[PDB]
Each structure stands twice: as C-alpha cells, then as structure tokens.
C-alpha cells in the first residue's frame, strides 16, 4: 500500500503570491494554467515561469515536461517567478486586460530602476511621474507636502550618477510632472509609462555576450523584431540588424551560432557563445519572438 506524495510550490507575480500543491506527474503547462486561472490572465503567450536549477542557474520552466523532472531546486515550497518572457511590439494595441498591463508595468519599471534599460534623464523623470501618479493618484498640495517623494525609489542609479542634481531637485521636477497628470486614472498612468518605456532603445532586448571569429567581444540582442549585433561598449544602437524578413535560417552547433540570409548575395553571420546553454536560450527566444511576430501579421 501507499499514498500520493504531493509537492508544494510557490509562484510569485510582480505583486502577488500563490501557494499550492502539485503531483509527481504534474506538467509545467498544468502549473502555468493554474497560475493564470487564479489571477484571471488571458494574454498568456507573453509569460513563462522562472525557476532556479540545482546549480543556481535561472531557467524558464518547459511547459511540455513534468515540473519535478527539470532539476528545480530543493525547497519545501518550490519557488517560481511568473514573468514576461516576450514583450509586445506595441503595448497600447496588445495589452488589453488590466492585470496584464499592471504586470508588464511592474516588470518594466523594475528593469528600468535596476539600470537594465538606458534612460535619458528627462525621460527618466517623466517615467517616474507616471509611476507616482499610478501609486499616489492625483497630486494634492494639501496632502502631498514637500518631501512626499523622499523615500520613493524614483530614478535609475546611473541617471543619478551622470546628470548631477540634488535629491530634492529631482523630486521637485518629478512632482512638477505629477501635477500635470491631475486627470489620469491609475490604469491610464501605467500605460503612459509603458508607452514611453517601449520606445527606449534597450527596451525589450535580450542581451548576450558573444565573440566573432577574430575574437572581438560583441553583444547579441534578441527582441520582438529580430536580432542585432552591438559593439562591446554600445548596447544602445545596433551596428548590424537582422530583421526577421531578412533571416532565412538560424542554427547553432555547440558554441558556433550561424545566421543565414534570405538574400544569398549577403554573407552568413557567425558568432561564438561561451556555453552551449547560451545558444539554446538565444534560440528559444528567437523562435518565441518570431512566432509572436508572425501571429501579429496574419
């Protein structure tokens, strides 16, 4: 005789925590579908479940395999992060539910405040003002006294290191933009934020460290639109672009990655990843993004 051996898991979104039990034969898709059911999200094609493997490596959970058969780490509750893996080409057209908008807003704002996306200072200040309007609501001089933003994490650190102003000057500029949003609904605010963030050059780009045959260190970008190559010191502006419509075939063998063009007159592009794992992640992101790109154009 015997009994089932359930398995506790914890799944966090950007603003929520879920805890429940699964079975030794529970698939990732079954876990994913229960996550999005409980929070009421239908725009699921953007998202995945992040976990940490036995060796501390961050990993996207494969939905066509069992949750317990992917070397997820030992914790009585298994720990998953529900996050966006793909980003829309246009937030105003593609993010319909308020849950989806809020989750993208929270995730993108986290990336910006973590200095992942280069931001010009006046853009950063306008971004913060929308985040303030979404959090505080309408500015009121009798409620929001001077210093009301003093404990808010408002700007990316690297904006503060380059453009030199005092803490109170930054907040006064942010407060001044907060005032002009007197009409804005919280949900409308997060969308204005997203509409601004999505035009930043580094927004939505997955960056990987690579080299070419001669050994020059480059950056490889994967985004909703295709691939890009950057020089080592400039992650903003691609040096070579690889839009989907120009790519005929991408492939890798161990560390060697090859991009082949539709126009046979153009030369194949070849670069080298440090690990096989890197090339696998690049290909999963290429295939996912290209798939969503195609579906939008049907």
């Amino acid at each position: 005789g015997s009994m089932p051996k359930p398995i506790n898991v914890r799944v966090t979104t950007m603003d929520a925590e879920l805890e429940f039990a699964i079975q030794p034969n529970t698939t990732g898709k079954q876990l994913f579908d229960q996550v999005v059911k409980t929070v009421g999200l239908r725009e699921v094609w953007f998202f995945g479940l992040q976990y940490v493997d036995s060796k501390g490596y961050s990993t996207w959970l494969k939905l066509n395999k069992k949750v317990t058969q992917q070397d997820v780490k030992k914790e009585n509750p298994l720990q998953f992060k529900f996050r966006a893996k793909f980003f829309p080409e246009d937030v105003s057209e593609e993010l319909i539910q308020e849950i989806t908008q809020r989750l993208f807003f929270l995730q993108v704002k986290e990336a910006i405040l973590n200095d992942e996306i280069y931001c010009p200072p006046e853009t950063a200040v306008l971004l913060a003002s929308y985040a303030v309007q979404a959090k505080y609501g309408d500015y009121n001089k009798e409620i929001h006294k001077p210093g009301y933003l003093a404990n808010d994490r408002l700007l990316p650190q690297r904006v503060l290191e380059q453009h030199k102003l005092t803490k109170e000057q930054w907040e006064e500029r942010i407060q001044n933009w907060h005032e002009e949003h007197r009409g804005m609904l919280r949900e409308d605010s997060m969308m204005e934020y997203l509409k601004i963030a999505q035009d930043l050059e580094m927004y939505g780009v997955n960056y990987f460290e690579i080299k070419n045959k001669k050994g020059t260190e480059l950056w490889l970008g994967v985004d909703a639109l295709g691939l890009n190559i950057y020089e080592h010191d400039d992650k903003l502006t691609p040096k070579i672009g690889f839009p989907w419509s120009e790519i005929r075939n991408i492939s890798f063998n161990d560390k060697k990655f090859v991009i082949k063009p539709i126009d046979k007159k153009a030369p194949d592009f070849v670069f080298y990843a440090p690990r096989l794992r890197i090339n696998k992640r690049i290909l999963a992101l290429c295939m996912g993004n290209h798939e969503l790109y195609m579906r939008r154009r049907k």
Partner: peptide, 7 residues
C-alpha cells in the same frame, strides 16, 4: 549539440 529554425 545542434539545432536549427528555418523561418
């Protein structure tokens, strides 16, 4: 190992 996506 090796993989391909043909687009």
């Amino acid at each position: 190992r090796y993989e391909e996506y043909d687009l």
